[PDB]
Design a protein around this ligand. Structure first.
Ligand SMILES: [Ca+2]
Ligand SMILES: [Ca+2]
Length: 191
């Protein structure tokens, strides 16, 4: 019952985890989750446990949605590993399509102004109140951060932000990168 070659290959292209590491992790995953599927509540519990200083429910729910790629209401091992990797490992620039999916809350193919606010707020809640005191003054509340992102993209209130533009802007404008950042440790390291 080893993890398949096909899934191993995909995971190794999309993360830097090794085959040995992934295969070992998967065997324990199955022992603890014998259906090979994690529910949203179970995923939330992981983030509740490992961010005790934060309020991670909203963030974990958005991450779950983003990585439940077949929309079946559970994460399989592949989806779960990619989700954990998104929040906690690897380089931002290799994740920008997933970042787009995170920000496109309703999945309609574009990001709206309110979606930016929703996701920025969920991310902001991953930071301890103590660490927020060290954010730049003009970037120290979700409202300021979200408004600034929208302004950096040059958008009218009812405009729709495409993935093409999202990726361009996050690559080119390092201030956009800073503000859209979704890995809690990177938001912290930056401040
Ligand atoms: Ca799924
Ligand atoms: Ca949308």
């Amino acid at each position: 019952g080893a993890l398949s070659k096909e899934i191993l290959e995909e995971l190794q292209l999309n993360t830097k985890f090794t085959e040995e590491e992934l295969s070992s992790w998967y065997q324990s995953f199955l022992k603890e989750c014998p259906s090979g599927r994690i529910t949203r509540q179970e995923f939330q519990t992981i983030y509740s446990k490992f961010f005790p200083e934060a309020d991670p429910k909203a963030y974990a729910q958005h991450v779950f949605r983003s990585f439940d790629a077949n929309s079946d209401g559970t994460l399989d091992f592949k989806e779960y590993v990619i989700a954990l990797h998104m929040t906690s490992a690897g380089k931002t620039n290799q994740k920008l399509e997933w970042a787009f999916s995170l920000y496109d809350v309703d999945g309609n193919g574009t990001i709206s102004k309110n979606e930016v606010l929703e996701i920025v707020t969920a991310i902001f809640k991953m930071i301890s109140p103590e660490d927020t005191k060290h954010l730049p003054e003009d970037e120290n509340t979700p409202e300021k951060r979200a408004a600034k992102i929208w302004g950096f993209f040059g958008k009218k209130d009812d405009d729709k932000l495409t993935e093409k533009e999202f990726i361009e802007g996050t690559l080119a404008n390092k201030e956009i990168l800073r503000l859209i950042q979704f890995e809690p440790q990177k938001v912290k390291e930056k401040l």
